[PDB]
């Protein structure tokens with residue numbers, strides 16, 4: 001066996017060498033002190049980690065029996081009796097300190113990217129700045145009506161619409177004293193203020209404070225930098241450029257400050273099932289903190305001249321979080337003496353936290369300037385599970401020699417037992433917490449699994465509008481604002497998965513900042529630059545203070561189970577949900593299992609590209625597992641559907657292995673089936689157990 005004994009642990013050698021040879025040098029941490037720390041932390045914390053996991057099963061079993069023997073007073077009383085619904089703590093204010101401004105103050109988009117893909121992770125870190133011309137010209141925010149269609153070459157009819165769109169943005173964000181930007185013919189900086197040339201007059205900024213800087217000579221600058229609600233707009237000025245030639249002010253582009261923070265994902269969008277997989281993950285995370293990851297390279301910072309005349313710089317990179325995995329899974333990258341696998345979550349803290357120290361120091365220019373290590377922790381259930389994550393970070397800080405509370409924690413509110421105790425979860429981390437975020441996809445899967453025995457749920461799509469989720473979204477903001485999150489921590493909302501439907505994202509996702517969210521999740525750098533628009537039209541700081549003190553969601557609203565009313569569907573409706581669910585499951589799982597791809601675009605039954613990840617997978621299989629459980633469909637239907645959709649997914653992928661015609665010969669196909677047929681028996685509906693096992697089994701038979 002290629003393992004390394006360290007006390008009670010047997011470290012997979014690939015991981016052993018990587019830490020010693022790549023992650024520890026630079027940190028001043030003695031390798032044997034590190035590995036005695038791993039050993040000791042694993043030994044001391046693994047038992048409660050397991051106790052907490054058993055707490056989950058015991059609660060779900062009591063809820064199961066309860067349903068099997070719809071009064072809300074009784075339900076609330078029973079949940080209280082079994083310790084599911086814990087009392088509300090007294091009002092309080094978080095004490096988290098040492099946090100960078102991108103999280104305390106600035107409201108804006110938040111990109112999430114799979115850390116196992118270096119080209120993506122680089123573009124995400126770079127997406128702090130994004131071309132708005134590119135985002136309007138490339139997507140459907142400029143519709144492709146007659147004459148405005150994208151071709152192989154530039155469509156100036158379309159590009160002129162792009163200019164016109166952006167001009168209206170400039171007018172509505174950084175207004176002139178009089179006139180419009182569309183009538184601009186030039187820009188100069190004189191006596192520290194910005195003067196815009198109009199045809200017949202010459203106006204300046206209504207709020208000249210919105211003037212932030214410029215590059216080049218003030219006599220005629222190369223760009224003009226503006227600020228509005230804490231976010232920067234940079235007008236690029238280049239007449240002999242291709243777009244600028246046509247522009248009335250020689251404007252070449254409008255750069256938006258976009259992905260303020262980026263989450264490098266080790267969880268639901270990657271497939272890492274062994275030390276080989278985690279080491280690729282960790283290595284990329286290291287190359288991000290060290291600054292030297294190259295596929296494409298991290299951008300330098302941006303240089304400006306202040307309106308006064310001095311120089312200054314702004315970060316060229318998005319402030320990086322890392323999303324660890326949660327308390328459930330173990331990974332054989334480390335086994336113990338008895339052969340038991342070590343909990344993956346404990347390992348990510350040790351290893352991503354260690355690696356993140358490189359981001360606190362100068363790179364051959366930094367991540368956090370204030371000394372924090374920003375860790376999203378997902379899939380927690382209740383305040384005890386938070387206090388445990390806190391304790392884990394405390395022991396890792398000791399092993400790493402970091403000051404206490406260096407390791408900050410972005411709380412995912414995405415599990416029902418966290419929602420209905422959210423105040424207490426925020427309090428458990430009152431000195432560590434940097435955001436709460438509504439992980440609404442995960443949170444729907446737990447909604448289905450928790451009440452699986454109560455009856456059939458409503459269709460997947462009906463769920464984004466059910467009472468419980470509207471209540472959960474408001475309750476989240478109310479709790480964050482109440483804990484004093486405004487000006488201290490982020491209040492975050494969820495991912496826009498329709499990667500191609502950018503006109504719809506620009507039309508509807510504005511709902512999130514309007515709901516008091518200082519950040520919300522985007523799937524691409526482009527989506528971040530287009531979601532940046534909403535923070536220029538919504539004053540989130542104002543919105544949050546208008547909200548402060550409100551209580552908009554009662555406990556009964558949150559506990560409104562999404563049961564389907566009595567005989568609410570026709571055959572064509574039931575079949576379509578099944579077909580649409582089976583195809584999303586298949587199209588995702590087949591790339592997970594056969595190729596180790598943790599996120600990919602899979603077009604639903606209506607041909608809309610949906611960015612799929614493990615959370616949308618938990619919804620699909622849990623819903624179908626629930627309809628199967630309550631008679632809505634037969635096992636014939638599930639198999640017919642899985643078989644009808646399998647060859648379509650083959651077509652959409654046509655170096656990959658088809659699933660049809662020999663379905664029971666495809667490991668990926670059998671995994672899809674198991675996720676459904678076993679779905680009711682996976683803990684809390686979690687898909688990693690089936691996914692990790694089937695991925696491991698494909699890698700093994702591929703090696704033989």
Ligand SMILES: O=C(O)/C(O)=C/C(=O)c1ccccc1[N+](=O)[O-]
Nearest residue numbers: 112269439440441442611613615
């Ligand atoms: O609802 C939550 O549980 C949540 O955390 C969702 C996401 O993670 C997500 C969902 C679909 C695609 C891509 C991502 N992503 O983050 O990259």
Ligand SMILES: [Mg+2]
Nearest residue numbers: 173228229536
């Ligand atoms: Mg404003």
Ligand SMILES: [Mg+2]
Nearest residue numbers: 268439442615
């Ligand atoms: Mg999630």
